[PDB]
Design a protein around this nucleic acid. Structure first.
Ligand SMILES: [Cl-]
Ligand SMILES: [Cl-]
Ligand SMILES: [Cl-]
Ligand SMILES: [Cl-]
Ligand SMILES: [Mn+2]
Ligand SMILES: [Mn+2]
Ligand SMILES: [Mn+2]
Ligand SMILES: [Mn+2]
Ligand SMILES: [Mn+2]
Ligand SMILES: [Mn+2]
Ligand SMILES: [Mn+2]
Ligand SMILES: [Mn+2]
Lengths: 104, 107, 97, 83, 91, 93, 97, 78
DNA sequence: ATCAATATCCACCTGCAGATTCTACCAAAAGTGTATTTGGAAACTGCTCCATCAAAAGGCATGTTCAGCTGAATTCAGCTGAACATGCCTTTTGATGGAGCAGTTTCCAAATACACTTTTGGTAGAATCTGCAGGTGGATATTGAT
DNA sequence: ATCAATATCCACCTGCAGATTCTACCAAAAGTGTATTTGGAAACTGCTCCATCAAAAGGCATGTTCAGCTGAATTCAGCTGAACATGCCTTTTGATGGAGCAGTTTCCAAATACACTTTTGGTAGAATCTGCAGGTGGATATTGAT
């Protein structure tokens, strides 16, 4: 009582994120009181958004656990997530697409 | 008597300034004595490599003064520099003359 | 009345502009376009004149690069005429679309 | 003051042709001139948006060449020659 | 050896209490969070240095967010960040 | 105010390779962006290397590996030789 | 007896492999190639088994990515059959050459 | 070894990429591309290994190498 | 488009085992409280350089006419790549050891940070130098018509 | 093939905008002396990693046959390039107020730096369960043929 995450009403660990930011900058740089809070908040939000979309993907396949495939379905199917996350999702596969001129 | 660190390493490029910049960037907690030396040497070698080829381009166009055009001709005609700067734009550099063969009139 | 065949003068122009380095878009119209786009994002901006020139160098290099790639898409379809679909293929493959 | 409108059409058909010549293009279909404008505007929108974000962050009212250079670097179109 | 799994899992429970997450999927989420953090921290670091500052403040985090996220995502991210700091500085 | 630059060092190196040859200010602008760009790519990679290996200190060894990650083959080899040379010379006082 | 037309099974396979996410190269050959290439850079190396898997994932995602752009290039040339010139165009426009 | 990457395996990769009909010259072209891809990632990864003074290429070595090459991979430590 | 056979698919269940989840304990974070610092924000303000105005000129943009040759369409056949059933061997799989080796500690020598206190190289303009842009004219292609 | 009709060199010429030198403060490099880490070297673990071995299993190589796709060939409507007339608006050259960057100071609000005291998330064994992968039986899709 009381953790910085709790003060700010976040699940994500403000204390840790401050420590990481402090490591990026050095003892010769500085980190503001709230930069850790803000950063933590941004990370939690984007996490929730991906989990929200991937969770729908897994329910729509009637499945309890989110898997890499559901993460790929959710990401690649959402225009804003798709442009933000150009990384390769291990075990994601691709979205089914067959070009018009190739169908019988 | 004060003897310059660049001189101790046998360099033109400023070892002291490069050390200061390495600290200013907070790239890490400490900076070793040899890091700025080594880094100065690399930058100087790359500069030399580019001025050598740009200088040669200038001569081919019968000019005394290197311009961005010469710097471009020198970069793009060299395979490794072209790769090193493969996503860089050189203002007022132009392009290399290059016309695809199918576009030429068929004699 | 002498008359160059179609394509002779286009080849001459390629050689001419591939040899020079001058900006190929007129400066004042490009600057008005910068000012118009920027104003729709934020009112009452001023511009350093070098910032407008940096933008024009960038745009022109970008566009020349795109046309190089567009040209290879046309040639690939066994054409010499570049078309909107060549541009779009180039930008799709470049990851811009 | 004065209203800014339609300045995209300042990017003329001959300027586009010239740019296409430097890019080694010999023949240009009629529809290219409007595609190119569209493509140009998007490119410029994106660089200016970033350039102005840098400007606002520095609490300036003036867009500096550095703002633009940083914007171009952000988008992987690194530009030499302007600081 | 640190991870974000605990936190990812808590957030999973808020938005989908019925849903679980496989191990491999947790791996992706972890990569995701480390990636976005480095991108933002890095841009925020550059912003401060561009302006001859040594402090990464929440203000840099915000511009960094505006530079990195595409539109609706940025709007909402910015709102969440301000909401979190507001709550934090109230106490 | 004072605005530092690499211009006089570039100019020295130019004279060594081409004593007869000048450089326009615009070209010097480009050489300057070039040197900052490379400095930053190398310092950046070095910094990451150090952090990946839990090291607080960037040494010639980090710069060297960064050079090897950044430069394409032949330029890497020669840059390494020149850097190594300059460190061994520097450290022999 | 029975025989599907050319293209029929092809489309069937596309649908099947676009549905699934299992690696499509066999692990042992792939692992063998990795170690061979690696040996030219540094002799006597061990590999975390996760390092080999990370490579195979990055590598399959890349080639699958590349076949998509390749297909767009073949379609552009009014073909349904990909050829090396299609791969070369895609890799060129991508800046990998 | 590079021929360990077989015609049907290359065929499957193209299928996932939505390709219907494959010229016979593709399989060799693909192996050359695949080889250059691995050469570049592996070289960088080994450079990280060697920097760490290790003899064991780690998943993180590969992840850092992929990231360096703008082929960021998720699910192996970043 | 239907008459009929051949295989793909697609549901809806189902049972196993590889992964999950849950549950039980110990150190490095993470939080509190003092004390000490300091980076950068507020407050003039000197003073670049940005916007704006004017005005004269010609380089180019615009719009037109005309037809060369291009893109698009259509047709055809040699032949390349898909489909398949055949027959085999390489990859998968699953402990089992063995060992090489990543990953910890324990000194301390070497190296780096820090704090002053002198020294000097690099910078901002002033002062001098001089490459070449731009303008012109004949020599040398280059092109396109008979 | 010749030539006419233009385009394109290429070299010779010379004042001026722009580069190269020359000076004059100063910020920041370098020299010391002291305090502080660091991250190597040896002596050793406990993994994971390589290496067999050893089934059977799939998946690959193989050759045949032919559907249908790619290219080559041929036509032609009409798009787009070349040339031209006409004149607009960009470019060039200055000058001017004044916005607003930016260069020095000044003192807190906000930062680091300890010495604390708690607590949390990483870990290594316990306690289910999701869903993979099969097995049905039912349409479906696909392909040959009044
Ligand atoms: Cl803050
Ligand atoms: Cl060092
Ligand atoms: Cl089109
Ligand atoms: Cl081909
Ligand atoms: Mn507007
Ligand atoms: Mn070995
Ligand atoms: Mn201060
Ligand atoms: Mn044609
Ligand atoms: Mn036939
Ligand atoms: Mn001096
Ligand atoms: Mn001239
Ligand atoms: Mn199933």
């Amino acid at each position: 009582a009381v953790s910085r995450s709790q003060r700010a009403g976040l699940q994500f660990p403000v204390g840790r994120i401050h420590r990481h930011l402090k490591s990026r900058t050095t003892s010769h740089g500085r980190v503001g009181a709230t930069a850790a809070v803000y950063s933590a908040a941004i990370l939690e939000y984007l996490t929730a958004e991906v989990l929200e979309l991937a969770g729908n993907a897994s329910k729509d396949l009637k499945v309890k656990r989110i898997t890499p495939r559901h993460l790929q379905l959710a990401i690649r199917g959402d225009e804003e997530l798709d442009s933000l996350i150009k990384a390769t999702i291990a075990g994601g596969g691709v979205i089914p697409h067959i070009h018009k001129s190739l169908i019988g | 008597k004060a003897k310059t660190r660049s001189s101790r390493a046998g360099l033109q490029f400023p070892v002291g300034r490069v050390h200061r910049l390495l600290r200013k960037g907070n790239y890490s907690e400490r900076v070793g004595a040899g890091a700025p030396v080594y880094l100065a040497a690399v930058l100087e070698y790359l500069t030399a490599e580019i001025l050598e080829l740009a200088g040669n381009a200038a001569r081919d166009n019968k000019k005394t003064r290197i311009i961005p055009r010469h710097l471009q001709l020198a970069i793009r005609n060299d395979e490794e520099l072209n790769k090193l700067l493969g996503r860089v734009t050189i203002a007022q550099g132009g392009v290399l003359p290059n016309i695809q063969a199918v576009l030429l009139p068929k004699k | 009345p002498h008359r160059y065949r179609p394509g002779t003068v286009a080849l001459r122009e390629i050689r001419r502009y591939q040899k020079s380095t001058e900006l190929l878009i007129r400066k004042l119209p490009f600057q008005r376009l910068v000012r118009e786009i920027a104003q729709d994002f934020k009112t009452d901006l001023r511009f350093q004149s070098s910032a407008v020139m940096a933008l024009q160098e960038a745009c022109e290099a970008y566009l020349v690069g795109l046309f190089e790639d567009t040209n290879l898409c046309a040639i690939h379809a066994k054409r010499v005429t570049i078309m909107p679909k060549d541009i779009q293929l180039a930008r799709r493959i470049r990851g811009e679309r | 003051r004065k209203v800014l409108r339609d300045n995209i059409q300042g990017i003329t058909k001959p300027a586009i042709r010239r740019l296409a010549r430097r890019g080694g293009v010999k023949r240009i279909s009629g529809l290219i001139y409007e595609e190119t404008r569209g493509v140009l505007k998007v490119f410029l929108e994106n660089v200016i948006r970033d350039a102005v974000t840098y400007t606002e962050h520095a609490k300036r009212k003036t867009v500096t060449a550095m703002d633009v250079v940083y914007a171009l670097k952000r988008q992987g179109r690194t530009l030499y020659g302007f600081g | 050896k640190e991870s974000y799994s605990i936190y990812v899992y808590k957030v999973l429970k808020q938005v989908h209490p019925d849903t679980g997450i496989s191990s491999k999927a947790m791996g992706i989420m972890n990569s995701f969070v480390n990636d976005i953090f480095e991108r933002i921290a890095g841009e925020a670091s550059r912003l401060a240095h561009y302006n001859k500052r040594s402090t990464i403040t929440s203000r840099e985090i915000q511009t960094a967010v505006r530079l990195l996220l595409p539109g609706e995502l940025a709007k909402h991210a910015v709102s969440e960040g301000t909401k979190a700091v507001t709550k934090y500085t109230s106490a």
